[PDB]
Every structure is written in structure tokens, then in C-alpha cells.
Design brief:
The structure is cut from a larger assembly and holds one copy of chain A (about 150 residues), one copy of chain B (about 160 residues), three copies of chain C and two copies of chain D (about 35 residues). Chain C has about 300 residues and is α+β, with helices and mostly antiparallel strands. Chain C has five helices and 14 strands. Chain D is built from one helix and no strands. The radius of gyration of chain D is 12 Å and the shape is elongated. The chains are: A mainly beta (about 150), B mainly beta (about 160), C alpha+beta (about 300), D mainly alpha (about 35).
């Protein structure tokens, strides 16, 4: 989850101001402009920090889910669990931030494509990696990218 | 034709399905930070309202004329007939709203393409599509002009079939 | 003015004796609204709003919100100015004709100005009521020799784009067939979101006589009232009889959101300033009135005609 | 300006016509007030 | 504030012209209680008491007395915040669009802020009424493209753990079968000791038309009212017709101890402080509203659905 | 604090919204008072 | 100077002077253009003429 709410018994020492932003709970983007377009959409699964595709079908309104390729619609940068909604930057808007990478093979200067699971994988091109893949926890890898569209 | 289109002898007769009007507000979901541009359009060649338009630089001014997806500059969302001015949302911006189509039977979720007349058609016609267009609702006829709710988000990387 | 205009003084004194028009019973108090005009046309604009998409959930940051659109519709109404002339006795000549407890020449049918104006106003009010009910102007029981009127000037009976039903001459005396046609028209009625409103029915004496017959221990009138209550959200249903109709049934709601009457504020009779005078004791006066101003939405009036041949 | 008001005194025929119209409107309002169905 | 915010001034001046919601007719005055919450969830705790044993007779000396216990139950209700955007003219620009007897561009469908807000508020109130009656949010006549809603957000029609009856498509026109299903649902209804309370029934126009038919000189509506009076201690029974329903019948009591509406005090439309402005004469404004807050005890609502296919 | 009062002068937007809510509540109470089923 | 940025007063004065020159040109000639060649004219409404046209 984006913010796993767990109670603790001791305070965690947090004084260093470096290597403190690369975390799974840091939503949004590293650099954001006031004129960035954001759309809230109903979601299924957990597409947080992943490429999202719009799935269209009691008939319900279209939703979004993790995906990519020819069906890529946008990037999920923030999530609200109570309302079960996801904030999405459309593919027509450039974005700079940390996204989920398939594995640790991604390095700097690498052109990256959103796979069927919304993860960034090496090689149409969609993003250019800025830093190396870093393991936040278990198999979760976060890579800083600057999305520019589709080739 | 026109958008406003007249004295009536009597008034025309729930909240549901009242948006099915030719002169309805084009944006189903609007947003500040959407860029809107003004251009001139030909007042005798083709009426660009709710159609995909292209930039034609003439010897006196830059006009917008109905165009295909291959050379599309944007979508004409409104027209001021008094000044013959067309308002265009560039293709670089997202759109979700009602546009003119020529097929009266289009289902929801189908892939769509803009033809030479700036008209929504099914993407299976054969021309390679270059824009991501999806039908958000079934096409409806206003008695006659056919309209459909569509979502347009940028260009397609590799042209499809 | 009253020191100089005896006729104006008399009109102001006797204006209260004129009876109220009976057309007021056919409308709710909110349905009638005066306008300032004598002759010409006036355009009415009605504004509406609609929802373009589902409402947008406000959570975290968002800039794309659903929109609400607007629409307009224009309806033109025509107004016509009509006039009448009547003869009366000159003011200075009343003393020579004041008889025992009555004034005026019985032999020559001459009247004082006040009485003449009152009677003429009553007649003109009756004519206005006839026009409002039927939409035509005629002084004959047959209803012919109708004065030609402008378009966009209709009554409750001839308003276009409403539910017209016709009962064939073979079933002119079959209340079951008439009620079948009435049910068909009531089903075809379209009240939309304003269905919770009182309803008004106007019938002719023959129709009322047929209605008060037993239902083939219930009456056709009761059955019709129940049928109308089934659609008007169990609200009031009023029934009226008018001698101006002939084998016609009118059904319409008393709601200002569907039917609106916007008469000119000079519609009722008004004296004219010009008075014809000569060397004799007989003078002439003029009365003005204005016709037009009924407005209705489409498919909200049921008009049933029982053909006699 | 209404003819029902005793203190009202018109100046000219235009004011007389306005008073007549106001009187008719007030009479219609009173009729709708007193009407029972 | 009114010296600076013209839009707030106009909202204050025109707030009174918005008609009251029709959903108030479906609830008693005591059944509605506002709460202070925009978005989130609220936990309501209901306390009860019970007798552990027979009472103790006080005679001579005794220390062992019967006890009275207590119990609690927690219910969670979800509230959702929704927003709409509408375009309008600017205050400094209204003067250049003030035409004769109207203001606004007929060609461009642009209205002054007050009129635009009034129309948008009316539409949003209609949507809120539809949600309260049905529990679903949609803008299409087919009822599709529904907005997915949070759990614990139910309407009268879709509230779970209530009595649900189904009339087969083959019996869609058999009022006897429909009334048999209604009687079965009423028998399955459980009101306990709160049975002495008025009852409310909501029906679609088709069912309203069927109800006035003769019983098979008595009406199906009369028989239904008598049957409900048999169970509700012969209290008042109200019948309502709504176009928001289709082939559905809703029966429920008006007792605040069984069904309670706890809406947010911001549920009805409210303007937002943010107003979009640019160099042109067109501005944008936002209206907020809140959905959710219906609570009901188990097995206290009868919902009859007549299948058409 | 309600918008019905002529003497009520709101200071800020929060007070304006509270007044709107109070006006809605008062209108609901008045509607239920005047309702006769 | 290096970025061609001015105070609002001076910028407004210069822009107003330029617009006044353009208005004078339109009044005298009846056409609106920013080119010495006179081409790329802005299309105007009917019944909008100058002394020369």
C-alpha cells in the first residue's frame, strides 16, 4: 500500500536530509508545474506509480488499471484508498518522477517502455531513465524517469 | 449549417439525457490549464464546429479547415459565427466530449478515426490510424446529425490497421 | 382631469360594477402575468441546464471536473388591438331624459354614458372569454364568419403540437369509446418532472350529461377523475362546463411551468379619449381591448373532439 | 395608482389608463384570493 | 465580504429562488438529522437495555436484586464529496450583454452568474433526489455508465438486508399476482413494537395506472391501503408517484426509530470560493455537494420489482 | 446566522457557507411546518 | 537590459503608443496589418471600412 498504517512502539531516528526522498510513500513528482493536468479516475487492483490503461465495459463507467503498450492512457502518481480513486497524469502531459521498474537491469540513459503490467522495461519509446533502479523493498524497484510521450 | 439554429409557436417539452443537443457544451469534463486558440475558418467551404481541423496558411491569414487524422492540428470546439472565428483545442491536449460522426451505429469502447471531413468513423475502414480515439458512448442521432462521446489523448506511436 | 372629463369621471365611478371575467377560473393565480404592450410581437426566452457527465469526486489533487451546460429557446407571441364604437346620450342632455327612476329614451334605445359603457364592457369581456377559450373570434352560434387573426395567437383548443383525439360519428353516443379515446390521449400526455400539479377539465353540456350517466354504482365522471388522479400524483382535478364548446373536451394542468398566460395589461376594455360630438344630443365613444398571449409547452394539452357526422 | 383608492386623483388620460389597468390587476388578485374550489 | 465578493453577494441574493427538494416528502420531519462532515466516515453507536430476570420483590431484608444489562451496536456511514463546474459571464461584462428584458448571449448560451447558479443548483438537487430514491448515480435514461460508489452508501431501493420481492415477467400485467407478492412482503416485514407508525409507499407511473383499476366498486389502491392499515395499527398510509422509478414499489415506515436520514449539512449545493478568470469575459465557477447518510434497521423496507423480461 | 436576516453581514466565506447551511435547514423546517398531507 | 524587461508603467506606455499607431493606420486605410508589404491582413467584419476603402 502507498501508506501502510502500522503502530510503532519507538520513534525512528530521522535527521539526515539526504537519501530520504526515494520511498514508496512519496507521491506526486519531483518537479511539478501549476499547469499540469490531473484527472481522478476509479481504479481496480493497485496501479500506484504505474502506467494505467482505461478499461471500458449493471453497466458502470470506465475505470483504469495497470497496463501499457498500445493501450497506455496515463501514469498513476497518487492514490486515495478511502474513495478508491487514482490521480492520473495523461500521456499527453510530461512527467518527472520515480516509477516502478520491472527489474534492476534499468540504468541511466536507458529508453524505457511501459509493459503490460505498467512497469518500465528496457527496449515505440515512452521514457528516458535518469537514475539506476533502486530496491525499496523485496522486488520493488523505483527508477527516476522523465516521461515525454510515445516516441 | 449552424449551432444555435428560430422562433417557436410553443415551447419544447427528467434530468437524464438532456445533453443530447447539437449546441451542447463540447467538453464533457473541462479543466483549467487547457489551451484554447483562435483561428479563422472558411465561411463557405466547410463548417468546422465539432470537427477535427487542420491549419492552412493562406496568403492573407492562417485558416482552419476540416481535415483528416494524418494532418490534424486539433479539434474545433466552438464557433463564433458573427466573427466567423473557430476555437481550437490543440491535439497536444486531452479531450473528452461530443464530436460529429457519420456512422449512426457505433458501440462503446470501439476504436475510432477522423476522416478527411473531420468526422469520426470506425477505425476499421482501412486507413492507418495515428490518433488514440475511443468511443465513450453509443452514437446518437439528433433529428439529422450524428454525435458521439469520445476521448482523444495524443498521437499513436505506430500506425495501426 | 376629473373636473374636465365627465366621461372619465363616470368610467372611474362605474368601473367597479363590471363583473369579473369567468376565464380566471381556468387558470391558477401564478399562471397569469401581465405584459406592457398594445400591438406587435414579443419574444420570450427560456433557459435550461443539463449535466454533461457524472460528478467529479474531489480527492487529493484534481483539475479536470465535470461540466454543466446551458440551453435557450425563443418563442414569439403576437398581440392584436381591437376597437368598438357605441352611441350614448350627451352629458348635458341627461336632464331632459331623466324619467321616473330611469334615464334614457325607451323609444329610441338611448342610454347614459355610464350604463352604455358598463353593458358594452360586459359584452366585450364575454367576447374576450370566448376567444381565450376557443382561440377564434366570432359573434355567431355557428362559429362562422371568424375574424382573421395573426399567427402565434392561439387558444387552449387550437394550440398546435398538442394531443388531439377524434371520436368517430358512429360512436358519438358511446361513452365507452369516448373514454377509450380519453385514456389514449392521457397516456400520450407528457408532463415530465411537473406531473405533480392540479388538473383542469372543460366539457360541454352534452358531454356533462353523458358523464353523469352510470358507468357501464359508479359514474363516468368518477372514473375519469380517478384516471386523471392516477397521473397527476393524486392531486386536485377540477371539472367545468362551458356553453362556448361543442362536443369538445379539454384537459390541461394548472401549472405555470407548462402553460403560461401573459396578456397585455390593456387586454380588458379601456375607454378611448376621442369622443364624437355634434349639434345633436347623441354622442359616440370608443372602447379598446387587446387579444393574444397564451403560451404552452408541447404535448401538454389534450383536446378531444366528438365528430357528429 | 388605483381607482380603488379614494385619495387617488389622476392628472391626465395616460394616468387614468394606468389606474384602470392597476384596478383590473388588483381585482383579479382579489378574485384569486377569494376563490374556493 | 459582500463588499468584495460579488459572486457571494449574488448567491446570497438568489439562494431563495431554488425550490425545495422533493425528497423531503418521503421522510417525516423527525427522521432527518444533519451531521457535520464533508468527506469521510462517521461511526454511530446505538445503546440498548435488557432485563436479566424477573424483578425482585421488596419485602423484609434482601440483598440479591435482579439486574438490568446493556448492549451496544456500531454502524459506519460513508459520505462522498462531488463537484461540478459551469461557465458564466463576468460581472464587469454583464453591462455589455444586458439586452431588453433579458441578459446574456442567446447565440453563445452564456448567462449571468445568478441565473447560471440557480439552474445548476436545480439540476444538482434533481440528481441528489435521484440518488436518495434509488442509490445509484447516472445521467442516462438507460441507467448505464453508473458512477461506482463507496460501500455503506445505500438508497431506499438498493438497501441490503430488506424484504425483496420479484414479480415474474409472465405476470407483469396480473395485479392479483402483484398484490399477492405485496402481501407476502408485508407478512415478511418485521416492525416489532414500533408498528404504530405512518407508512409510505412509492410507485412508478405504470403501477399507479394499474392501481386505480377495479379490484378483482373497490380499487386495488383501496385494498392495498387497507392491507397496510392492518399491519401499521391503522395509522396514516401515504402514496406517492415518482418518475425516477421503473416497475418498482417501495413500502417503508416513517418512524425515526427504524429509518433515519443523517445527511451532511453540506449535502445541498454550495458555491466554492475558487473562480476561474482570464482576460476574456467568460469565467468558471464550482458547486460542491455531499452524498450519503441513509440508515435503516434490518427487514423494514419492502422492495417489489416487476420484471419486464 | 442565516441569510434570511437583513441585519446579518457575513465576514468571510466560512461564515457565508455556514449561513447557507442554516438557511437550507430553516427552509426544510418551514417546508415541514407548512406541509399538510 | 540583458533580458528586455521593463517596469509596468514604461511597458504600458510603449504598448499603448504602438496600439494607437495601429488604430490610426486602420482609421486612415481601413485595413489592419503589421507588415510594410501590407499583406497578412486580419479579416474584419462587414460594414467596417476606412476612408481609403
Amino acid at each position: 500500500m502507498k501508506n501502510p498504517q502500522h503502530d510503532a512502539s519507538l520513534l525512528s531516528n530521522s535527521n539526515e536530509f539526504r537519501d530520504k526522498n526515494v520511498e514508496f510513500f512519496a507521491s506526486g513528482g519531483t518537479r511539478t508545474s501549476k499547469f499540469d493536468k490531473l484527472e481522478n479516475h476509479p481504479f481496480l487492483g493497485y496501479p500506484y506509480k504505474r502506467g494505467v490503461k482505461r478499461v471500458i465495459q449493471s453497466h458502470y463507467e470506465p475505470h483504469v488499471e495497470a497496463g501499457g503498450g498500445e493501450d497506455l492512457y496515463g501514469i498513476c502518481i497518487d492514490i486515495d484508498e478511502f474513495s478508491k480513486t487514482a490521480t492520473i497524469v495523461p500521456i499527453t502531459n510530461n512527467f518527472e518522477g520515480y516509477l516502478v521498474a520491472k527489474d534492476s537491469t534499468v540504468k541511466v540513459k536507458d529508453k524505457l517502455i511501459f509493459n503490460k503490467d505498467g512497469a518500465l522495461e528496457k527496449v515505440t519509446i515512452n521514457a528516458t531513465a535518469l537514475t539506476d533502479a533502486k530496491q525499496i523493498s523485496n522486488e520493488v524497484y523505483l527508477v527516476k524517469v522523465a516521461v515525454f510521450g510515445n516516441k | 449549417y449552424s449551432k444555435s439554429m428560430i422562433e417557436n409557436k410553443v415551447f419544447s417539452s427528467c434530468f437524464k439525457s438532456k445533453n443530447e443537443r447539437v449546441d451542447a457544451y463540447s467538453f464533457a469534463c473541462s479543466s483549467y490549464t487547457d489551451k484554447i486558440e483562435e483561428y479563422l475558418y472558411d465561411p463557405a467551404n466547410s463548417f468546422p464546429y465539432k470537427r477535427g481541423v487542420k491549419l492552412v496558411p493562406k496568403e492573407n491569414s492562417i485558416y482552419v479547415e476540416v481535415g483528416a487524422d494524418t494532418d490534424m492540428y486539433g479539434i474545433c470546439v466552438d464557433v463564433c459565427e458573427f466573427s466567423c472565428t473557430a476555437y481550437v483545442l490543440p491535439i497536444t491536449n486531452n479531450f473528452e466530449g461530443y464530436l460529429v460522426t457519420r456512422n449512426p451505429s457505433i458501440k462503446i469502447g470501439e476504436i475510432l478515426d477522423i476522416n478527411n471531413n473531420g468526422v469520426i468513423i470506425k477505425a476499421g475502414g482501412g486507413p492507418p490510424t495515428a490518433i488514440n480515439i475511443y468511443a465513450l458512448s453509443d452514437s446518437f442521432t439528433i433529428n439529422s446529425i450524428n454525435l458521439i462521446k469520445v476521448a482523444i489523448f495524443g498521437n499513436r506511436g505506430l500506425e495501426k490497421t | 382631469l376629473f373636473d374636465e372629463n365627465y366621461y372619465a369621471k363616470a368610467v372611474a365611478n362605474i368601473i367597479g360594477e363590471v363583473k369579473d371575467p369567468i376565464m380566471y377560473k381556468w387558470f391558477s393565480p401564478d399562471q397569469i402575468e401581465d405584459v406592457d404592450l398594445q400591438m406587435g410581437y414579443q419574444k420570450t426566452v427560456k433557459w435550461d441546464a443539463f449535466l454533461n457527465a457524472n460528478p467529479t469526486t474531489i480527492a487529493n489533487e484534481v483539475n479536470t471536473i465535470s461540466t454543466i451546460g446551458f440551453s435557450s429557446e425563443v418563442v414569439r407571441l403576437n398581440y392584436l388591438k381591437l376597437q368598438y364604437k357605441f352611441r350614448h346620450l350627451k352629458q348635458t342632455s341627461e336632464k331632459f331624459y331623466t324619467s321616473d327612476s330611469y334615464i334614457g329614451d325607451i323609444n329610441n334605445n338611448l342610454l347614459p354614458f355610464a350604463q352604455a359603457y358598463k353593458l358594452a364592457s360586459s359584452e366585450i369581456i364575454k367576447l374576450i372569454n370566448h376567444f381565450v377559450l376557443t382561440g377564434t373570434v366570432s359573434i355567431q352560434k355557428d362559429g362562422k364568419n371568424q375574424k382573421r387573426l395573426l399567427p402565434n395567437m392561439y387558444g387552449l383548443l387550437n394550440m398546435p403540437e398538442q394531443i388531439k383525439e377524434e371520436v368517430a360519428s358512429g360512436d358519438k353516443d358511446k361513452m365507452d369509446k369516448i373514454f377509450e379515446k380519453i385514456e389514449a390521449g392521457l397516456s400520450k400526455l407528457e408532463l415530465g418532472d411537473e406531473f405533480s400539479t392540479p388538473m383542469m377539465v372543460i366539457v360541454d353540456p352534452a358531454t356533462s350529461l353523458k358523464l353523469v350517466k352510470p358507468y357501464a354504482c359508479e359514474k363516468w365522471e368518477d372514473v375519469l377523475i380517478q384516471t386523471i388522479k392516477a397521473i397527476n400524483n393524486r392531486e386536485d382535478v377540477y371539472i367545468e362546463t362551458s356553453n362556448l364548446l361543442k362536443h369538445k373536451i379539454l384537459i390541461y394542468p394548472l401549472n405555470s411551468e407548462l402553460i403560461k398566460f401573459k396578456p397585455s395589461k390593456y387586454m380588458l376594455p379601456t375607454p378611448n379619449e376621442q369622443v364624437d360630438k355634434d349639434s345633436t344630443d347623441v354622442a359616440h365613444s370608443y372602447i379598446d381591448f387587446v387579444l393574444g398571449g397564451l403560451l404552452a409547452t408541447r404535448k401538454t394539452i389534450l383536446q378531444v373532439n366528438i365528430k357528429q357526422s | 395608482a388605483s381607482l380603488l383608492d379614494s385619495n387617488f386623483v389622476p392628472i391626465n388620460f395616460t394616468e387614468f389608463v394606468q389606474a384602470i389597468s392597476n384596478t383590473y390587476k388588483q381585482r383579479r388578485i382579489q378574485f384569486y384570493e377569494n376563490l374556493k374550489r
